[PDB]
Amino acid sequence: TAPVRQEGIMTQGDLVTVTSDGIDLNALWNS
Amino acid sequence: TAPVRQEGIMTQGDLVTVTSDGIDLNALWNSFAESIAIYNEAMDNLIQLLTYPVTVPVEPVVQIGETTFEEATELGVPRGAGLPIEVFQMGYDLRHYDKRNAYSWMFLADADGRQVEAIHDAVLWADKRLVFRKVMEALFDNRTRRANIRNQAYNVYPLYNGDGVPPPRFKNNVFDETHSHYVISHNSVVDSSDLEDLMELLAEHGYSPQAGTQFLLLANKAETDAIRQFRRGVVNNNGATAGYDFIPSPTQPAMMLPNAEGLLGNQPAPTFGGLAVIGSYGFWNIVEEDYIPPGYLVGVGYGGAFNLGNPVGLRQHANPAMQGLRIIAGNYQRYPLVDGFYARSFGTGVRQRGGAAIMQIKASGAYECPPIYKKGGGFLV
Amino acid sequence: RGVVNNNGATAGYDFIPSPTQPAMMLPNAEGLLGNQPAPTFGGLAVIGSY
Amino acid sequence: RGVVNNNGATAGYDFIPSPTQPAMMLPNAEGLLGNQPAPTFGGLAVIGSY
Amino acid sequence: ALKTKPRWDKYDGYVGNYRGVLGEDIDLDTEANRVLAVGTNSNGAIVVGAGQTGIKGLMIVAVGADIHGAMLDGGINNHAGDPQDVGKHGEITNFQPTVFGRTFGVAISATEGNVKLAVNGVDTGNIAYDTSAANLKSGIVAVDDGFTADDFTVTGTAPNFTIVTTRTDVTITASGEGVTVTEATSVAAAGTNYYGHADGTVNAVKGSDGVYVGHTQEADRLIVNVKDEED
Amino acid sequence: ANRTVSPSTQGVRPAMRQMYNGRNVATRPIPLIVDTSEIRAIMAAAADAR
């Protein structure tokens, strides 16, 4: 969607996890 | 009917009785019921076409990144890849409304049951007008709201208004946070180009005739009397040129045409939902009514590949015992007074912020909410 | 419809003659969209509609 | 047909809208000069012909 | 999501690239998710900028942020005594120059009277045309904003000058006529050599210090090839 | 498939009829307008004169 391109090795800190609001961000990749 | 609001404890002297002339005034209470029935029908059709029941109190929206290939070489290696995601949320509010009625024992001793049944019926009418006003505020009132849901606060949004997260990119269309659906015509009278601009505010997000979206234009008679004049290639108000003809609905009065095949294509269907269609212009089905105030155009998209629903969600309280309109026994239950309460709780917000647009027809300045549907203006239409 | 009239007015509609009226040539009128008015309203004879 | 467009060009045909497009009133007793297209070409959506 | 951050694209770690330990905490608001020029202190430890040894490599302290845009302090790669990787050879992608603080260029169009600057939107009162540098600095700190003569540095002995702020949150601007203020921004450029400074910044400018660290190719990429600092 | 829709595609076929053309015939009847007051005045005078 957004015209932004992350290029590089996926480190820790590039992880996506359940947020403090309890939204499971990893359920939303198909959006 | 008359805008007079008697409020108090009902006493003797507030009693209505058979006259000495034998006129039973208590037979006459429900005599307006057919002029009420037309206002009731108009509000029913607008509510079922503008609203849905909220089943999920908080809605998420996300923005995801992208990547690209590159051209290969025989000894080197290409660049890596990753996706950044972020999320935002929006809700629907919930507020509480009530009314009392109270009687003295001297009223209750002598009152005809029909006088108190008429007061009950006037309360149900005020309840429906409260719901209609708050639904129409959710659509017309340009400002963002706040609400607390499961012990956390949320934004409660209208259509795009230059506030909140920008609309997502669609094809070559990009939007910033100032993007708004509450635009103005920049002229004192409606053009055909205004109907084309209002249409572009939906089509910019892919909500489009090509995607299978159907379109409803709701307008005042003061606008439809001008739109009925629009003819393809003819110069119009403010020097606009009409790109289409206004095509009349089969319920309009008969007319002569230059050709025994009258139109290339069909006439519009005479009803959209339950609403009475006067005609169509371009992809708009046109409904006229003065529940839309003069100088305002409301364009609403339905269906298509993006599954556009009705624009306003109605939230009721989560507990079924708090849902609906309810009658509560009062604090006075004996003598010399008796009282009781009516109560309802509900609230409103928009999920699909791009699925509709509103244009105020004027030369200059920001969009103004019509006072009839500005939040603070009261509890009746 | 759309033609100028007495006192500079424009007609919003055509006069549609009823079925009893004579078959008569008119400019810009090869077809009628919709119905002709019924020839009688109550007992009275209807010449047309506007 | 016969109306001047941009740059003084005069159209020798009418733009004929496709069956999916919004309707138009036929301007003249003469039909539009052209043929109405099918609503698709291959799998593409056709707006009209010229 | 709004932003890219710098990362290693290619990094081997059996060549001249190495594990070390941090000699000091990384400032998450200023130094996380940035390309830092690093050296070694008098112990064995990695330090941002020139240590005892001068600039010996580049480092990216990769840190996760919440959806609200802020960074967790509970990490295991950013406090003193934490391990970190350092590169001499490799590629960095989504590259950007590294700058600390804010910097402003001031030029006076007036040759008469006095001109008016603002600090976070509240005015200096009056600056004469033709001040000394110390008189210009004094007029900046004299605002009742709670910023002081250690938050700022000023240099310039001409109508032109420059204000350098070690903080991130002070904006110097013009408010009157006779003076203008341009913030000195920094973006990656294609086909450009980049240099690591004793500050730990990385910039296409070399000065009295600035060992070579690499060159870009396309502006979003840095080809890292550190020419280590030497006695 | 092509998903395109419009007020035409969702709408209804026009209720079109053909006017009296007054063309491609050998003769056209004289257009003889006669209002109900004229028929009564004729019929009453014819009855009075008999």
Short mmCIF file of N, CA and C in Angstrom, two decimals, chain B residues 94-147:
data_model
loop_
_atom_site.label_atom_id
_atom_site.label_comp_id
_atom_site.label_asym_id
_atom_site.label_seq_id
_atom_site.Cartn_x
_atom_site.Cartn_y
_atom_site.Cartn_z
N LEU B 94 -21.67 6.47 22.77
CA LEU B 94 -22.87 6.02 23.45
C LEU B 94 -23.25 7.06 24.50
N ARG B 95 -24.47 7.57 24.43
CA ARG B 95 -25.01 8.61 25.32
C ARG B 95 -26.38 8.19 25.82
N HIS B 96 -26.86 8.88 26.84
CA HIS B 96 -28.07 8.54 27.57
C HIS B 96 -29.06 9.69 27.54
N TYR B 97 -30.31 9.39 27.24
CA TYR B 97 -31.37 10.37 27.12
C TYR B 97 -32.57 9.90 27.91
N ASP B 98 -33.28 10.81 28.54
CA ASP B 98 -34.48 10.48 29.29
C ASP B 98 -35.52 11.60 29.30
N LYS B 99 -36.73 11.26 29.74
CA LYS B 99 -37.87 12.15 29.88
C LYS B 99 -38.67 11.74 31.10
N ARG B 100 -39.37 12.65 31.75
CA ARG B 100 -40.30 12.37 32.85
C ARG B 100 -41.70 12.71 32.41
N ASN B 101 -42.69 12.04 32.97
CA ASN B 101 -44.00 12.67 33.11
C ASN B 101 -44.53 12.45 34.52
N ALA B 102 -45.32 13.40 35.00
CA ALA B 102 -45.75 13.48 36.38
C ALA B 102 -47.17 14.03 36.42
N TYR B 103 -48.00 13.52 37.31
CA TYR B 103 -49.40 13.89 37.43
C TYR B 103 -49.76 14.15 38.89
N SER B 104 -50.61 15.12 39.19
CA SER B 104 -51.22 15.19 40.52
C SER B 104 -52.40 14.24 40.65
N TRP B 105 -52.76 13.88 41.87
CA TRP B 105 -53.91 13.03 42.15
C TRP B 105 -55.21 13.61 41.60
N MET B 106 -55.38 14.93 41.62
CA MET B 106 -56.56 15.58 41.06
C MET B 106 -56.62 15.46 39.54
N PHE B 107 -55.49 15.46 38.84
CA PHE B 107 -55.46 15.11 37.43
C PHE B 107 -55.88 13.65 37.25
N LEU B 108 -55.20 12.72 37.92
CA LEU B 108 -55.45 11.29 37.75
C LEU B 108 -56.87 10.85 38.12
N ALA B 109 -57.53 11.56 39.03
CA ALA B 109 -58.90 11.28 39.43
C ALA B 109 -59.92 11.54 38.32
N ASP B 110 -59.66 12.52 37.45
CA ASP B 110 -60.61 13.03 36.47
C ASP B 110 -60.18 12.84 35.00
N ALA B 111 -58.91 12.60 34.72
CA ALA B 111 -58.37 12.46 33.37
C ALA B 111 -59.00 11.31 32.59
N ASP B 112 -59.29 11.56 31.32
CA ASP B 112 -59.62 10.53 30.33
C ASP B 112 -58.35 9.76 29.97
N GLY B 113 -58.40 8.43 29.90
CA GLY B 113 -57.23 7.62 29.55
C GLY B 113 -56.61 8.02 28.22
N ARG B 114 -57.42 8.52 27.29
CA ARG B 114 -56.97 9.01 25.99
C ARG B 114 -56.07 10.23 26.10
N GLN B 115 -56.21 11.09 27.11
CA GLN B 115 -55.29 12.22 27.27
C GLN B 115 -53.89 11.73 27.64
N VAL B 116 -53.76 10.73 28.51
CA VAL B 116 -52.45 10.20 28.88
C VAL B 116 -51.87 9.28 27.81
N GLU B 117 -52.69 8.52 27.10
CA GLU B 117 -52.25 7.82 25.89
C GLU B 117 -51.71 8.77 24.83
N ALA B 118 -52.31 9.95 24.65
CA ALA B 118 -51.78 10.92 23.72
C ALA B 118 -50.41 11.44 24.16
N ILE B 119 -50.17 11.62 25.45
CA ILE B 119 -48.87 12.04 25.95
C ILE B 119 -47.83 10.95 25.72
N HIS B 120 -48.18 9.69 25.96
CA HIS B 120 -47.32 8.56 25.62
C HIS B 120 -46.96 8.54 24.13
N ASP B 121 -47.93 8.75 23.25
CA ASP B 121 -47.67 8.81 21.82
C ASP B 121 -46.77 9.98 21.43
N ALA B 122 -46.93 11.15 22.04
CA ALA B 122 -46.01 12.26 21.83
C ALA B 122 -44.59 11.95 22.31
N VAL B 123 -44.43 11.15 23.36
CA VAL B 123 -43.10 10.71 23.78
C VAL B 123 -42.49 9.77 22.75
N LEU B 124 -43.22 8.79 22.22
CA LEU B 124 -42.67 7.93 21.16
C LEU B 124 -42.28 8.74 19.92
N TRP B 125 -43.04 9.77 19.57
CA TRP B 125 -42.68 10.63 18.46
C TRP B 125 -41.39 11.40 18.74
N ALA B 126 -41.23 11.95 19.94
CA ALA B 126 -39.99 12.60 20.34
C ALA B 126 -38.79 11.66 20.37
N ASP B 127 -38.97 10.40 20.77
CA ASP B 127 -37.95 9.37 20.72
C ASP B 127 -37.45 9.15 19.29
N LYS B 128 -38.37 8.96 18.33
CA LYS B 128 -37.99 8.78 16.93
C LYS B 128 -37.27 10.00 16.37
N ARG B 129 -37.73 11.20 16.69
CA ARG B 129 -37.07 12.45 16.28
C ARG B 129 -35.68 12.60 16.91
N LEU B 130 -35.48 12.16 18.15
CA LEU B 130 -34.17 12.12 18.80
C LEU B 130 -33.20 11.22 18.03
N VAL B 131 -33.62 9.99 17.72
CA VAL B 131 -32.82 9.05 16.94
C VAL B 131 -32.50 9.61 15.57
N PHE B 132 -33.48 10.14 14.84
CA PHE B 132 -33.23 10.74 13.54
C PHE B 132 -32.23 11.89 13.61
N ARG B 133 -32.38 12.82 14.56
CA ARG B 133 -31.45 13.94 14.70
C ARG B 133 -30.03 13.45 14.93
N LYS B 134 -29.82 12.48 15.81
CA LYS B 134 -28.48 11.98 16.12
C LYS B 134 -27.86 11.17 14.98
N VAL B 135 -28.65 10.46 14.18
CA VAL B 135 -28.15 9.80 12.97
C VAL B 135 -27.71 10.84 11.95
N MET B 136 -28.51 11.86 11.72
CA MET B 136 -28.21 12.91 10.77
C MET B 136 -27.04 13.79 11.22
N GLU B 137 -26.87 14.03 12.52
CA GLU B 137 -25.67 14.65 13.08
C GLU B 137 -24.42 13.83 12.80
N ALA B 138 -24.47 12.50 12.89
CA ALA B 138 -23.32 11.65 12.64
C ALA B 138 -22.77 11.79 11.22
N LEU B 139 -23.65 12.10 10.27
CA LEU B 139 -23.33 12.32 8.87
C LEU B 139 -22.97 13.78 8.58
N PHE B 140 -23.74 14.77 9.02
CA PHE B 140 -23.50 16.18 8.73
C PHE B 140 -22.48 16.88 9.62
N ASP B 141 -22.34 16.52 10.90
CA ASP B 141 -21.46 17.25 11.81
C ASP B 141 -20.00 16.88 11.56
N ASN B 142 -19.27 17.84 11.01
CA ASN B 142 -17.92 17.75 10.48
C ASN B 142 -16.84 17.41 11.54
N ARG B 143 -17.13 17.55 12.84
CA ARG B 143 -16.14 17.45 13.94
C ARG B 143 -15.92 16.02 14.44
N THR B 144 -14.69 15.70 14.83
CA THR B 144 -14.34 14.44 15.51
C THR B 144 -14.82 14.42 16.96
N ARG B 145 -15.25 13.26 17.44
CA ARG B 145 -15.68 12.99 18.81
C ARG B 145 -14.72 12.05 19.54
N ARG B 146 -14.84 11.94 20.86
CA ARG B 146 -14.11 11.00 21.72
C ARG B 146 -15.10 10.15 22.51
N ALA B 147 -14.77 8.91 22.79
CA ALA B 147 -15.59 8.00 23.57
C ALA B 147 -14.73 6.98 24.32
#
